[PDB]
Each structure stands twice: as C-alpha cells, then as structure tokens.
C-alpha cells in the first residue's frame, strides 16, 4: 500500500520505498494477497469483436482476455487455474515476473511444470510482486495463447514522472480467424500470414464490413495521462503513434526509465511501454495508429489502418478527421536510448566471443517440416511429461539434447551472451528475444540497417567492442535480434532455476527457437519447498495419467 504517491509526487511510494529503491533486492512487506480464479473454456463458433465468427477460441472466464491482475508492489498474487478445455493441457506464464526463488511458478510446461490436464485439472500459482509496472500473462502450452489464453498485469508503484490519471492497460494484438494449432501447422511449411486484424484494447473495426468498433480513450483536457501499452501478439510487431501528440516513455517492460519523449514507438512481441500523454492540444478526436515498418520483416495486417480514437472530453463525437503523417520506419528495432532510473554498470571491454557464450540461431530447411529453427544446432523440444525440474528433483543430470540446456554455474555473476542471427543462411529475419527469470542488459547489437535488406554482420571485436555500452544500458525482458546480425546481452545469475530464452514469435518458438538456461542447478534443488515439490509431482502424476487418452499428437516444441 502506498502512503505518499500523489499526482505531483509519483516518485514516492511508502517509507523506505521510492523510484530510486533497488527493487531487485528490496520489496515492501505489505502482507496482502490478491487472488484470482481463471476458468479456461473451449468455445466453438465464437463471435469476435470485428463481427467475424471464429471456429474455436480458448477463453479465461468467458472473455476475450483474462482478468486484469492488479496489485501493489510487495503484494502476493495468487491465481487458481482450472483447465476446462477439452483436450489441451495448459500452463500460465507470468511474463515479466522474474519469480525470484519461485521457478516452479513460472508456468513453463516441460521446464518448470507438467501441463495442467483438461476436463477440470487445477493448480494454484503464487508469486511475490517484487517489480512494479506493466506485464502480462499467457499460456505456454504450444501456441495456445493465440486462442485467447492471455491477460494483463498491473503492479502499482512509483513512477519517473508526475501524472494525473492512470488510464491503465492498453493491450494491442494481432488477430487471426484461424485457430493457433491450425496456424502452427501452416507455418511449419509456409511463410506466416498477415494478421486478419489488430485489436486495440479488445476491439477493432472490420476493414471489409465496417462491423465492430474503434477502441475509444477519453482524455481529460489539460491533464497528464499514464497509458500502459502492450504488444500481446503471436507474431506482429507494432509501431504506435498518436496524431498531433508526443508520448513520454517512463518505463520499458517492467523497468522504470528516465522520461524520454518520442513521436512514435516500436513494440516487439511481448514488449511494454508506459507512456505519459499530455492532453495539451485542441480538444478534438485524434487517431492512435498502429503501423508496420521493416518492410514486412516483422509482420503485417490485412487491415490496412488499425487504429483507436483518443477523444478529448467535451469535444464532439464521431471519428477523427486528420489522417496524420506516417511515422518514421523503425525497421523492426526497439530503441536502445532508454536509460533505467536504477542503474547497472558492467564492463564490456573484456568480452571475448567463445563457443560457450555464443548462441547461433539457424533456420534448417533440410528436414521435416520445412521450417525448423535451431539454436546451437538443436531445435528445442521439451517433454511435457518429464520437465527439467523432474531431473533436478531426482538428481538426474542426463538432460536430453532436445532440451537445449545451457548450464550456468556462476554464482551471482554477470554472464554475457552473443546471439547470432543465421549470418551465413540464405535469409534471416528479426526475432524478439525474451528471457525468463531476469531482466537482461542490452549491451549492443549489429549496426542498424533496413530489416529486409539482407545485410549481414558477424561480431568483429576490432569494430564492435567500441559499439557496446555497459554504462546503464537498456534493461528489460525482451529485445530485438537484428535480421542477419547479432545481439549482445548480459544477465546476473541471481536466481537459481531453469529459465527459457526464446524468440517470442509463436511460430518460431513452436518451431524450435529457444534454449533453457539452467542457472545454478545445485542451489535450485535446495530452494524448492516441500509444498512446491509435492504439487509439482501431483500435477505431473495427473498429466501423465491423462496424456495417453489424448486424441491428438504433439506437433511442435511444446512451447
């Protein structure tokens, strides 16, 4: 609970807690639990928000998105998930929530848990809100979240700028009429489709029929509004802009940053930005536009102009009349100009590329199916019925090759990872890389070039060491791996657990694009509570009893 967070002083929170507190090591002790129940159901012939009926969706509590989780910094969040799907298992991952010493609540099926079985299986997740800001949750059972198993998280806390009104969450997502499993199958042998539409806060107009509605955000004239923008897509990467208005970024993913004013923002799959918008213009209706850059390298939609309306209270109704100017093309790249409020510094002039710190991403066309993604020579394929944690609990170190284990034994040390984007392959695509259990530092990437140009870069220390930044670089949970290039990341090994690190494009992680960082496995075993172990075993027993009865095969990585 806050005691001194006001519109003119958003920096403050409570005694000993403010915007400069190192939230990674210090958390308010509130004693409060916010609980939720997620009832997952399978709905056929569901009428979506743009008027088109979908074959099948999988919904939490009967809505397009699950409950908007809301709590205060230091609260505990507890969610009982009840799987009433017909065939699919499920596992809810809390994206952006680092699960400090709570790895078994990460929701990574095949890694930290077996899936919750259908026809009534249940599991209760319980995690501490040790970071404030805007995050989201979604199923990690193959590409199930593309069917509807997705929602938002708002953990309240201090901010790096004053503002008057918190508009709350604003999820933006691609929308397909085909079901997720259909699309996984299709993308195994075909380039992925454009989205049929892009929903903004749950709604959109159909570009063909005009059915549906624009999201409509009412701004209070003269007021400063915090808007929490998310990209909850399966594939599309968005540029966003508001006609005649700037946006001032105050957080990236769940990391507060120094205020940064911009005309447009790029959001990768899984990324979030908290912005402050001043309703300082003439009262009127203004378009909030979703647009695509990078010449389709990171998505497109069959709706040519997905948009929301921002309406000044007391202005006339109807639609905006100013179409605006197109934003700069972001070329499928997130900005590296954001600077966290609470700083980190690491050396970069000692980095040496080696097999054991390099992660070569490659598209392998030689097998079946056609599109298989490999990291360091292997496409990930996890065992839903024998998760990595089962090996840990049984003291078995014979991890299958397909689990793509990268064991990291270093204790609370900075570790450096060079990710290489198929620089020798026939073609390369941008990939939104996402790390569980940690924020990483973005130390640098290959030079910014047009995303579709097929220019390639291999890390060359004689030119590239000088291009790295270890002095409070961007810190977050998702960032772009440039088409044909490389990305250098660091994270500190402060959190024993098995942590996925994967491209967040659904089709690609389905197709194998992940590794699993096994961080300090010796320490992990000691820190698993009897309750967590017992419940892990309970759910695994039920899943293993269920699986033989499933009418459908597993067709992908499981992730």
Ligand X SMILES: *[C@@H]1O[C@H](CO)[C@@H](O[C@@H]2O[C@H](CO)[C@@H](O)[C@H](O)[C@H]2NC(C)=O)[C@H](O)[C@H]1NC(C)=O
Ligand Y SMILES: *[C@@H]1O[C@H](CO)[C@@H](O[C@@H]2O[C@H](CO)[C@@H](O[C@@H]3O[C@H](CO)[C@@H](O)[C@H](O)[C@@H]3O)[C@H](O)[C@H]2NC(C)=O)[C@H](O)[C@H]1NC(C)=O
Ligand Z SMILES: *[C@@H]1O[C@H](CO)[C@@H](O[C@@H]2O[C@H](CO)[C@@H](O[C@@H]3O[C@H](CO[C@H]4O[C@H](CO)[C@@H](O)[C@H](O)[C@@H]4O)[C@@H](O)[C@H](O)[C@@H]3O)[C@H](O)[C@H]2NC(C)=O)[C@H](O)[C@H]1NC(C)=O
Is 98 known as a binding-site position?
A: no
Report the interface residues with ligand Z, using CB under 6 A: 55-56, 87-88, 179, 181-182, 550, 552, 554-555
What dihedral do alpha carbons 90, 96, 97, 100 form, nearest 10°? 110
Beta bridge mates, 158: none
**The one among 307, 441, 480, 503 contacting Cu ion by CB under 5 A:** 503
Instruction: Residue 203: name its binding partner from ligand Y, ligand Z, a copy of itself, none (Cβ under 5 to 8 Å by kind).
Output: none
> Per-residue string for binding with a copy of itself, 244-283, x by CB under 8 A?
----------------------------------------
Longest Cα–Cα distance of the chain, Å, equals 67
Site for ligand NAG in 362-391 (CB under 6 A): 386
Least Å distance between CB 323 and ligand Y?
Answer: 4
Site for ligand D2M in 153-192 (CB under 6 A): 191-192
DSSP state, residue 295: G
Within 10 Å of residue 185's Cβ, how many Cβ atoms? 16
Instruction: Residue 179: name its binding partner from ligand Z, ligand D2M, a copy of itself, none (Cβ under 5 to 8 Å by kind).
Output: ligand Z
Token reading at 367? 């097998």
Decide if 77 contacts 161 (C-beta within 8 A): no
CB-nearer residue toward ligand NAG: 116 or 490: 116
Instruction: Residue 436: name its binding partner from Cl ion, ligand Z, a copy of itself, none (Cβ under 5 to 8 Å by kind).
Output: Cl ion
Contact region with ligand X (CB under 6 A), list: 163-171, 176-184, 230-238, 325-333: 163-171
Sign of the dihedral through C-alpha 378, 384, 386, 391:
positive
Quote the CA–CA distance of 508 and 514 in Å, as a whole number.
9
Beta bridge mates, 363: 373
What dihedral do alpha carbons 219, 221, 225, 227 form, nearest 10°? 30
What dihedral do alpha carbons 236, 241, 243, 248 form, nearest 10°? 160
Quote the CA–CA distance of 504 and 260 in Å, as a whole number.
26
* Residue 417: alpha-carbon gap to chain centroid: 20
Can residue 287 be called a binding residue for ligand Y (CB under 6 A)? yes
**The one among 135, 197, 289, 446 contacting ligand Y by CB under 6 A:** 289
Can residue 509 be called a binding residue for ligand D2M (CB under 6 A)? no
Can residue 436 be called a binding residue for Cl ion (CB under 5 A)? yes
Quote the CA–CA distance of 105 and 436 in Å, as a whole number.
12
Site for ligand Y in 310-339 (CB under 6 A): 319, 323-326
Tokens 């392959």 correspond to 425
Least Å distance between CB 559 and ligand D2M?
Answer: 17
Please count the residues of this chain forming the interface with a copy of itself, following the rule CB under 8 A.
Answer: 24
Token reading at 189? 């042998």
Site for ligand NAG in 244-283 (CB under 6 A): none
> Per-residue string for binding with Cl ion, 83-102, x by CB under 5 A?
------------x-------
Contact region with a copy of itself (CB under 8 A), list: 59-67, 262-270, 364-372, 408-416: 364-372
Closest to 256 measured CA to CA, from 133, 162, 136, 72: 133
CA distances from 362 to 89, 413, 546 (A): 29, 29, 35
Site for a copy of itself in 452-491 (CB under 8 A): 452-455
DSSP state, residue 194: P
Quote the CA–CA distance of 386 and 367 in Å, as a whole number.
26
Is 434 known as a binding-site position?
A: yes
CA distances from 404 to 240, 346, 371 (A): 35, 27, 18
Can residue 427 be called a binding residue for ligand D2M (CB under 6 A)? yes
CB-nearer residue toward a copy of itself: 222 or 326: 326
Least Å distance between CB 184 and ligand D2M?
Answer: 13
Is 93 known as a binding-site position?
A: yes
Decide if 28 contacts 137 (C-beta within 8 A): no
**The one among 123, 224, 237, 431 contacting Cu ion by CB under 5 A:** 431
Can residue 285 be called a binding residue for ligand Y (CB under 6 A)? no
Least Å distance between CB 382 and ligand D2M?
Answer: 21
Closest to 121 measured CA to CA, from 111, 109, 129: 109
Pairs from 121-125 (Cβ < 8 Å, separation ≥ 24):
121/82, 121/83, 121/89, 121/539, 121/542, 121/543, 121/546, 122/80, 122/81, 122/82, 122/83, 123/80, 123/81, 123/535, 123/539, 124/78, 124/79, 124/80, 124/81, 125/78, 125/79, 125/81, 125/92, 125/94
Least Å distance between CB 212 and ligand Z?
Answer: 22
**The one among 26, 87, 124, 190 contacting a copy of itself by CB under 8 A:** 190
Is 140 known as a binding-site position?
A: yes
Can residue 371 be called a binding residue for ligand D2M (CB under 6 A)? yes
DSSP state, residue 350: T
CB-nearer residue toward ligand Y: 263 or 323: 323
Instruction: Residue 534: name its binding partner from ligand D2M, ligand NAG, Cl ion, none (Cβ under 5 to 8 Å by kind).
Output: none
Token reading at 420? 């290489």
Quote the CA–CA distance of 3 and 1 in Å, as a whole number.
7
Decide if 435 contacts 481 (C-beta within 8 A): no
**The one among 359, 388, 503, 559 contacting ligand X by CB under 6 A:** 359
CB-nearer residue toward ligand NAG: 84 or 454: 84
Contact region with ligand X (CB under 6 A), list: 39-47, 211-219, 246-254, 424-432: 211-219
> Per-residue string for binding with ligand NAG, 14-53, x by CB under 6 A?
-------------------------x-x------------
Site for ligand NAG in 76-105 (CB under 6 A): 82, 84
CB-nearer residue toward ligand X: 130 or 438: 438
Look at residue 197 and give its three-state secondary structure. Answer: strand
List of residues contacting a copy of itself (CB under 8 A) = 189-194, 292, 295-297, 300, 302, 326, 365, 370-371, 426-427, 449-450, 452-455
List of residues contacting ligand D2M (CB under 6 A) = 191-192, 363, 371, 426-427, 429
List of residues contacting Cl ion (CB under 5 A) = 95, 436
């Amino acid at each position: 609970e806050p005691t001194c967070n006001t519109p003119s002083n958003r920096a403050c929170w409570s005694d000993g807690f403010d915007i400069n507190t190192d939230y990674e090591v210090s958390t308010p002790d509130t004693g409060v639990t916010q609980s939720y129940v997620f009832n997952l159901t399978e709905v056929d012939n569901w009428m979506g928000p743009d008027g088109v009926v979908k074959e099948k969706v999988m919904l939490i509590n009967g809505n397009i998105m699950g409950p908007n989780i809301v709590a205060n910094w230091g609260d505990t969040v507890e969610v009982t998930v009840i799987n009433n799907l017909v065939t699919n298992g499920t596992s809810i991952h809390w994206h952006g929530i680092h699960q400090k010493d709570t790895n078994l609540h990460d929701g990574a099926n095949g890694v930290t848990e077996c899936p919750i079985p259908p026809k009534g299986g249940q599991r209760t997740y319980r995690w501490r809100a040790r970071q404030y800001g805007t995050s989201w949750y979604h199923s990690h059972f193959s590409a199930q979240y593309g069917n509807g198993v997705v929602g938002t998280i708002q953990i309240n806390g201090p901010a790096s700028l004053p503002y008057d009104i918190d508009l709350g969450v604003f999820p933006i997502t691609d929308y397909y009429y085909r079901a997720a499993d259909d699309l996984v199958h299709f993308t195994q042998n075909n380039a992925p489709p454009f989205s049929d539409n892009v929903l903004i806060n749950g709604t959109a107009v159909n570009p063909n029929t005009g059915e549906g509605q624009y999201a409509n955000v009412t701004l209070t004239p003269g007021k400063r509004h915090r808007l929490r923008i998310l990209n909850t897509s399966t594939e599309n990467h968005f540029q966003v802009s508001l006609v005649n208005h700037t946006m001032t970024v105050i957080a990236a993913d769940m990391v507060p940053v120094n205020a940064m004013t911009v005309d447009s923002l790029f959001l990768a799959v899984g990324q979030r930005y908290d912005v402050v918008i001043d309703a300082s213009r003439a009262p009127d209706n203004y378009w909030f536009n979703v647009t695509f850059g990078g010449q389709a390298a990171c998505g497109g939609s069959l709706n040519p102009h997905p948009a929301a309306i921002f309406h000044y209270a007391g202005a006339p109704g109807g639609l905006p009349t100013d179409e605006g100017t197109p934003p700069v093309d972001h070329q499928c790249l997130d900005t590296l100009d954001v600077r966290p409020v609470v700083p980190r510094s690491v050396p970069v002039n000692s980095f040496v590329k080696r097999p054991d710190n390099t992660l070569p991403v490659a598209l392998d066309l030689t097998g079946t199916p056609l599109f298989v993604w490999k990291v360091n020579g292997s496409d990930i394929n996890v065992d839903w019925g024998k998760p990595i944690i089962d090996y840990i609990l049984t003291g078995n170190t014979s991890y299958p090759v397909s689990d793509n284990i990268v064991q990291v034994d270093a204790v609370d040390q900075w570790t450096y990872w060079l990710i290489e984007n198929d620089p020798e392959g026939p073609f390369s695509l941008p990939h939104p890389m996402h790390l569980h259990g940690h924020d990483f530092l973005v130390l640098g990437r290959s030079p910014d070039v047009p995303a579709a140009s097929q220019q390639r870069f291999v890390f060359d220390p004689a030119v590239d060491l000088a291009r790295l930044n270890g002095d409070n670089p961007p810190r977050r949970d998702t960032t772009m791996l440039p088409a044909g290039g490389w990305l250098l990341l660091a994270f500190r090994t402060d959190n024993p657990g098995a942590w996925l690190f994967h491209c967040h494009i659904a089709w690609h992680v389905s197709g194998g694009l992940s590794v699993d960082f096994l961080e300090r496995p010796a320490d992990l075993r000691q820190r698993i509570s009897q309750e967590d172990e017992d419940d892990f075993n309970r759910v695994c027993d039920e899943w293993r009893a269920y699986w033989p009865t499933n009418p459908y095969p597993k067709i992908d990585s499981g992730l």
